Amino acid sequence: MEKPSPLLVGREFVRQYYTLLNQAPDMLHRFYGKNSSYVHADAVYGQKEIHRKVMSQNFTNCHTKIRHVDAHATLNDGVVVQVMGLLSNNNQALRRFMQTFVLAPEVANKFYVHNDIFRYQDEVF
Amino acid sequence: SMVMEKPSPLLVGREFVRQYYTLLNQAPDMLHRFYGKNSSYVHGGLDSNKPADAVYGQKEIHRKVMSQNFTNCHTKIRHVDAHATLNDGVVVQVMGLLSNNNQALRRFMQTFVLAPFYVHNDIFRYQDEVF
Ligand code: NA
Numbered sequence: 001m002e003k004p005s006p007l008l009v010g011r012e013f014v015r016q017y018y019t020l021l022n023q024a025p026d027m028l029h030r031f032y033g034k035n036s037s038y039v040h041a042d043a044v045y046g047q048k049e050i051h052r053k054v055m056s057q058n059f060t061n062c063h064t065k066i067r068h069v070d071a072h073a074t075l076n077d078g079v080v081v082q083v084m085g086l087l088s089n090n091n092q093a094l095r096r097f098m099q100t101f102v103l104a105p106e107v108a109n110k111f112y113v114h115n116d117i118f119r120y121q122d123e124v125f
Numbered sequence: 126s127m128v129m130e131k132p133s134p135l136l137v138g139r140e141f142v143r144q145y146y147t148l149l150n151q152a153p154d155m156l157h158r159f160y161g162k163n164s165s166y167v168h169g170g171l172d173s174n175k176p177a178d179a180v181y182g183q184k185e186i187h188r189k190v191m192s193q194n195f196t197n198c199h200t201k202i203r204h205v206d207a208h209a210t211l212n213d214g215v216v217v218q219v220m221g222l223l224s225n226n227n228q229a230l231r232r233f234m235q236t237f238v239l240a241p242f243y244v245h246n247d248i249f250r251y252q253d254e255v256f
Contacts, residue, residue, distance in 0.1 A: 067255050068176055070236075070248045070250070072165040073163070073165070074214075074238045075214050075245050076211040078210075080216065082236040084250060084256070100236045102211060102216050102238070104211050114210060115210050119204060121220065121234075121252070124204045124220050125222075
């Protein structure tokens with residue numbers, strides 16, 4: 001109990017991530033570093049290339065409803081997060097999705113996104 | 126003597142997923158041997174309230190695995206994506222259908238974290254209990 005709970009870290013990151021996704025997706029890049037991987041399909045790496053991928057997807061009035069968040073301590077003082085929720089982009093029907101994050105220490109209890117893996121359900125089943 | 130590139134995270138993750146769900150069908154009593162101290166595990170479920178809480182450590186994990194009464198558990202994996210992560214570990218995302226005790230197939234969303242098999246984290250949720 002010498003650091004905030006992984007659940008607090010994970011849940012507040014998810015809050016800020018999907019808020020930024022709706023309000024300024026061109027700012028999402030601040031979460032990523034050199035080693036970061038973004039999957040949303042083939043992976044892209046690094047802030048510049050991740051930013052380019054994010055802006056390619058045209059997140060327009062993206063609205064998210066989080067239905068559950070699991071967040072646990074993982075190796076090397078990281079936090080692994082699994083998000084289940086619904087997402088509406090461009091005012092279309094909400095679609096169920098998975099999102100897996102691995103948060104790595106960036107500082108004092110500060111984290112950056114090392115892995116970001118998103119997948120819609122309907123595309124899979 | 127020899128030099129060969131390490132296997133891709135996707136090859137490692139896909140083989141782990143195969144072994145995991147093979148053991149879940151054949152001998153769930155040995156699933157716990159993937160986990161160690163400070164491993165986390167949850168497999169869907171609801172409380173009397175709400176999604177059930179995770180447990181930690183091989184021995185509680187074993188007891189929770191046995192609590193699920195995995196019997197004739199059949200799984201069809203529809204999506205697996207694995208990537209290198211911290212300390213050359215592997216993070217694996219899985220979506221598929223699981224039928225336990227000859228019941229109807231249920232969709233699920235799962236995340237694993239594997240050591241650089243050692244499972245650091247096993248996060249499994251049924252979609253029907255969450256959505
Ligand atoms: Na696949």
